[PDB]
Structure 1
Amino acid sequence: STGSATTTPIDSLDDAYITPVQIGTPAQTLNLDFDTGSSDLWVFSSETTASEVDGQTIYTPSKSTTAKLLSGATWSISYGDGSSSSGDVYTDTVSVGGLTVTGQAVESAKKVSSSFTEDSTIDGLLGLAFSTLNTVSPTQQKTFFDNAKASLDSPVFTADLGYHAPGTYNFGFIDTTAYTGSITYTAVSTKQGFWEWTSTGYAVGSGTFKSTSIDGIADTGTTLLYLPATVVSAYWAQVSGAKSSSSVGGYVFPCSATLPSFTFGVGSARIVIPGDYIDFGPISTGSSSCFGGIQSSAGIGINIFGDVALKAAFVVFNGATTPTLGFASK
C-alpha cells in the first residue's frame, strides 16, 4: 500500500504545515501537524477543557463506531518550545492520503497549553519519530508509520515541504518526479528516538564550504534551523545590521536587507537554502526589524534541521532495520 497527502502552510511565514487526517467511522477529518521530532498522535477532542478550545476541529470518539477506549492509558507530553498537552487514549481507524491503519492509538487531549489553544489552524499532532519516544503509559503505543510500515510497498515516508506553498507527504514510495539529481542516503542514529544524522558542513552565501561534522535531527515540527553558535554567527555576520537580541530572543536584521543563502552538506552533496527562506518577517506588526530563520542551538542541547532546512530538499525517511535519511535538491 501507499498514501499521499498534501501539506499546507498554516500562515504566510510557513510557521508550520497541516495535513488532513481521517479519524474514525464515519471519518472525522482533522488537520494535523506532522512532526518527525515526536511520536504521539494527539488531537483536540470532545474531552478537551472547553476554555482551551478556540476554533479547532475536534475528534468526538463517541460518534465513531470504530473507536475503543484504551483502558487505563494516559499520555502527557512537553515539547522543546515549552508547550504541552495530556489526556487519555482511544484506538480507532486512521487514514492519511488513502493509507489506512486500524487500531491506531489516538491520544485525546483533556488539557492543552495556551500556545495550542491560540493556534486555531492546528487540530493536533501526528508524530513520526521513533516509537520509543511515545508517551502513552503504562503501555507505550506505536506511531502511525510504525503501524503502517509492514503494509507499505517500501518502509519509507517522504517530506516535500513547500516554500510559501503546499507540499506533500508520501508513504510507501519515492516519487522520482519530485526532485532533481540524485538522493543522498546518510546514516541515522536512533539512540535518542529522533531522525538524528551528521551533516558534513556548511557554507554562507557564495563562500567556501567549511567541512565540519554537525550532528542534528530532521524535525518537520520545528519551524527554524537551529545550529551551533559558531555557524550561526558566521551566517549573520554577512548581513549588515544583524544582531542577536536578548529581549526578542534570537538574531534580527534590518527588514531592508537581502539575505545570503545557506548551504548544508549531506555527504558529498549540498543542499542550498535560498536567502528568502531565512526571512521570518517583522518581529511585531509594522516593525522594521526582521526575525531570522537560522538561530543558535546553544540553549537547546541539540541541533535541529527544521522546516527552514527541510523545505529546501526532498527528504526520505527510511524505517527499515538499518535506518537512513535521504536528501535531494528539488
Structure 2
Amino acid sequence: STGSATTTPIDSLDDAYITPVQIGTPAQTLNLDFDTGSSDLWVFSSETTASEVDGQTIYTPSKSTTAKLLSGATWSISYGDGSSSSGDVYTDTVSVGGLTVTGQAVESAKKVSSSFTEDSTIDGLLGLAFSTLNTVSPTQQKTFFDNAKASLDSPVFTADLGYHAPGTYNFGFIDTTAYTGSITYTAVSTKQGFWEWTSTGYAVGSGTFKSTSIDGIADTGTTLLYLPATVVSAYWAQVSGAKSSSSVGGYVFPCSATLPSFTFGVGSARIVIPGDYIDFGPISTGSSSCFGGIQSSAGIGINIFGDVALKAAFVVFNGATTPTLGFASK
C-alpha cells in the first residue's frame, strides 16, 4: 500500500504545515500537524475543555462506530516550545492520503495549552518520530507510520514541504519526479527517539564550505533552523544590522535586508536554503525589525533541522530495519 497527502502552510510565514487526516467511521477529517519530532497522534475532541477550543475541528469518538476507548490509558506531552496537551485514548481507523490503519491510537485531548487553543488552524498532531517517545501510559502506543509500515510497498515516508506553497507527504514510495539529482542517504541514531543525524557542515551565501559535524534532528514540527551559536553567529554576521535580541528572543534583522542563503551538508552533497526562506517577517505588526529563521540551539540542548531547512529539500524518512535519512535538492 501507499498514501499521498497534500500538506499546506497554516499562514503566510510557513509557521507550520497541516495535512488532512480521516479519523473514524464515518470519516471525521481533521487537519493535523505532521511532526517528525514527536510520536503521539493527538486531536482536539469533544472531550476538550470547552474554553480551550477556539475554532478547531474536533474528533467526536461517540460518533465513530469504530472508536473504542482504550481502558485506563492516558497521555500527556510537553513540547520544546513549552506547549502541552493531555487526555485519554481511543483506538480507531485512521487514513492519510488513501493509506488506512485500523486500531490506531488516537489520543483525545482533555486539556491543551494556550498556544494550541490560539491556533485555530491546527486540529492536533500526528507524530512520526520513533514510537519509543510515545507518551501513552501505562501501555505505550505505536505511531501511524509504525502501524502502517509492514503494509507499505517500501517502509518509508517522505516530506516535501513547500516554501509559501503546498507540498506533499508520501507513505510507502519515493516519487522520483519530486526531486532533482540524486538522494543522498545519511546515518540515523534512534537513541533519543528522533530522526537524529549528522550534517557534514555549512556555508553562508557564496562563502566557502566549512567541514564540521553538526548533530541534529530532522523535525517537521519545528518551524525554524536551530544550530550551534558559532554557526548562527557566522550567518548573521553577513547581514548588515542583524543582532541577537534578548528581548525579542533571538536574532533580528532590518526588514529591508536581502538575506544570504545557507547551505548545509549531507555527506558530500549540499542543500541550499535560499535567503528568503530565512525571513520570518516583522517582530510585531508594523515593525521594520524582522525575525530570523536561523537561531541558536544553545540551551535547547539539541540542533534542530526544522521546516526552514527541510522545505529546501526532498526528505526521505527510511524506516528500514536500520533507519536512515535521505536528502535531495528539488
The TM-score, its normalising length taken from structure 1, stands at 1.00
The unaligned stretches of length 5 or more in structure 2 are none
**Residue in 2 aligned with 1:176?**
176
1:178: how far off?
0.1
Q: Please list the CA deviations of residues 160-217 of structure 1 after superposition, one character each: whole Å capped at 9, or x if unmatched.
A: 0000000000000000000000000000000000000000000000000000000000
Distance in 2 between residues matched to 1:229 and 1:259, nearest whole Å? 18
Aligned to 1:65, the other structure's residue is in SS state: coil
Q: CA separation in 2, counterparts of 1:19 and 1:240?
A: 37
SS at match of 2:235: helix
How far apart are 1:319 and its partner, in Å?
A: 0.7
Query: What does 1:23-102 align with in structure 2 at a 5 Å threshold?
Result: 23-102=23-102
For these two proteins, the number of residue pairs brought into alignment is: 330
Instruction: Report the equivalent of 2:160.
Output: 160
- Measured against aligned partners, the alpha-carbon deviations of 1:17-54 in whole angstroms (never above 9, x if no partner) come to 00000000000000000000000000000000000000
Deviation of the 1:14 alpha carbon? 0.1
SS at match of 1:233: helix
**CA deviation map 1:258-299 (0-9, x unaligned):** 000000000000000000000000000000000000000001
* SS in structure 1 of the partner of residue 51 of structure 2: helix
Q: Secondary structure at the match of 1:45?
A: coil
In 1, the alpha carbon distance for the partners of 2:275 and 2:112 equals 35
For residues 131 and 34 of structure 1, the distance between their equivalents in structure 2, rounded to whole angstroms, comes to 14
Give SS of 2:115's match. helix
Shift of 1:244: 0.1
Task: Please state how far the C-alpha of 1:74 moved relative to its aligned partner.
Answer: 0.1
* Off by >3 Å, runs of 4+ in structure 1: none
Matched position secondary structure for 2:300: coil
SS at match of 2:69: strand
TM-aligned CA deviation for residue 253 of structure 1: 0.4
- Cα offset for 1:112? 0.1
1:136 corresponds in structure 2 to 136
The aligned counterpart of 2:213 is 213
3-state SS of paired residue (1:29): strand
Partner Cα separation in structure 2 for residue 53 and residue 4 of structure 1: 29
Write out per-residue CA displacement over residues 101-128 of structure 1, whole angstroms, 9 at most, x where no aligned residue.
0000000000000000000000000000
Give secondary structure in 2 for the equivalent of 1:145: helix
**What SS is found at the alignment partner of 1:100?**
strand
**Sequence identity, in percent?**
100
1:251 Cα shift?
0.0
Q: Report the Cα distance in structure 2 between the residues aligned to 1:328 and 1:55, rounded to whole angstroms.
A: 37
Q: State the superposition RMSD in angstroms.
A: 0.2
Which whole-Å CA distance do the structure 1 matches of 2:58 and 2:149 have between them?
27
Take 2:327 and 2:319, find their aligned partners in 1: how far apart are those partners? 15
| Local SS of the residue matching 2:146 | helix
CA distance in 1, matches of 2:255, 2:95: 42
Report deviation, 1:137: 0.2
TM-score by length of 2: 1.00
- Distance in 2 between residues matched to 1:294 and 1:190, nearest whole Å: 25
Q: Which SS does the other structure have where 2:168 is aligned?
A: strand
State the Cα distance separating 1:309 from its structure 2 match. 0.1
What whole-Å deviation, never above 9, does each CA across 1:228-249 have from its counterpart, x for those lacking one? 0000000000000000001000
Instruction: Measure the CA separation in 2 of the matches of 1:163 and 1:149.
Output: 29
Deviations 1:116-153 (A, max 9, x none): 00000000000000000000000000000000000000
